[PDB]
């Protein structure tokens, strides 16, 4: 079930093949509760480059 840490985000990144950015999620406090609320600007603020950002947004917006 949903908890306030990072496990669901990590599983999502693994599926999307973007585990290298889990570090960015942790430093930017993009915890599991933020996942459905993520925005391009929030991801850009965590220093994630454009094409990876858009892969993640497309996913959390439609899934």
Author numbering: 191 to 253
Which passages does the manuscript contain on this structure?
Named Tric1 and Tric2 (tRNA import component 1 and tRNA import component 2), these almost identical proteins belong to the preprotein and amino acid transporters (PRAT) family of proteins but are distinct from other PRATs in that they also contain a C-terminal SAM (sterile-alpha-motif) domain. The mitochondrial outer membrane proteins, Tric1 and Tric2, contain a C-terminal SAM domain that is required for the efficient uptake of tRNA into plant mitochondria. In Arabidopsis Tric1 and Tric2 SAM domains have been shown to bind tRNAala via key lysine residues at positions 205 and 210 and are required for tRNA import into the mitochondria in vivo.
Additionally, the Gly241Glu mutation is hypothesized to push two neighboring monomers away from one another due to the extended glutamate side chain as well as introducing a negative charge. While the overall fold of the monomer does not differ from that of the WT protein or the Asp235Ala mutant, the number of molecules in the asymmetric unit and the overall crystal packing did differ significantly. Two molecules are present in the asymmetric unit and the polar intermolecular contacts between the two monomers were notably absent. Furthermore, the crystal lattice no longer showed a helical superstructure. Specifically, the close approach of the monomers for the WT protein due to the presence of a glycine at position 241, leading to a hydrogen bond between the main chain nitrogen of Gly241 and the main chain oxygen of Gly218 on the neighboring molecule is not possible when the glycine is replaced with a longer glutamate side chain (in the Gly241Glu mutant). The Gly241Glu protein eluted entirely in the monomeric form, supporting our observations from the crystal structure that this mutation disrupts the ability of the protein to oligomerize entirely. We determined that the oligomerization of the Tric1 SAM domain may play a role in protein function whereby mutation of Gly241 introducing a larger side chain at this position disrupted the oligomer and resulted in the loss of RNA binding capability.
